[PDB]
């Protein structure tokens, strides 16, 4: 095979709230990716906190031309629907009122991943593309433990931000009255040369979910070797949903 090695891998990460112990790991899950969308929940906890974001329905943007966005995006946006639909220029417009320092400052002081947003060296993104693939990284463990800390409210930010920021988690009903929280994230590795390889697709889906009073938290990332026709953030999403009441049994 004249390609390179597989690189495909799986995890998926379930921990109990209320005994802190792992209920059902499949895989290393210490890998560090990209986070994609799943990147949305710090950044509307940074938001919240800052004051760019108020609350669930404010403030309402406006897509306007000249402005990167597909075509299903380019409608009215609160954080309500840019958390539901991963609304990727919400992200920039909110980046661009914090600022390089504003945003490298939350993110260290929130630990996430290896808290680089600096971007790529050279190309001066890292506002707009550092959480795709040009910096930022963060491995299945780690988000299990941020939002671990973002459900009890011990993240370093006000706590009414982190209540905010779990109002607008985009929420989910699983067999057996499992309510879920969880943010999807769809993406492409890079190659050698720093370019997305789209025969490397990955897929998170990242969160917590309660029945009866009990707590997970969770995260599942497929990072495919070959192309995939539907985005595996969904579809790690669905097959999760699917799943949850036979691997939170433990």
Not at 108 to 113: A, F, N, S, V
Request: glycine share 8%; net charge positive.
């Amino acid at each position: 095979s004249n390609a390179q090695q597989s690189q495909a891998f799986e995890c998926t990460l379930v921990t109990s709230i209320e005994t802190g112990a792992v209920i059902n790991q499949q895989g290393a899950c210490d890998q560090r990716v990209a986070p994609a969308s799943t990147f949305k929940v710090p950044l509307a906890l940074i938001g919240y906190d800052a004051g760019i974001l108020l609350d669930d329905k404010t403030p309402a943007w406006d897509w306007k031309p000249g402005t990167e966005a597909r075509a299903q995006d380019r409608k009215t946006v609160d954080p309500t629907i840019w958390e539901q639909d991963s609304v990727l220029w919400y992200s920039r417009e909110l980046t661009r009122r914090l600022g390089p320092e504003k945003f490298a400052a939350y993110v260290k002081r929130l630990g996430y991943g290896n808290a680089d947003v600096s971007g790529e060296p050279g190309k001066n993104n890292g506002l707009t593309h550092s959480w795709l693939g040009a910096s930022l990284t963060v491995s299945p463990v780690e988000q299990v433990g941020f939002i671990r800390r973002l459900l009890a409210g011990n993240l370093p930010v006000s706590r009414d931000a982190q209540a905010k920021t779990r109002a607008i988690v985009p929420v989910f009903y699983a067999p057996e009255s499992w309510s879920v929280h969880g943010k999807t994230g769809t993406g492409f590795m890079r190659d050698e040369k720093g370019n997305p390889d789209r025969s490397r697709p990955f897929g998170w889906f990242v969160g917590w979910a309660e029945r009866e009073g009990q707590h997970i938290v969770f995260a599942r990332l497929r990072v495919a070797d070959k192309p995939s026709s539907e985005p595996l953030g969904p579809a790690v999403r669905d097959a999760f949903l699917r799943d949850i009441a036979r691997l939170a049994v433990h």
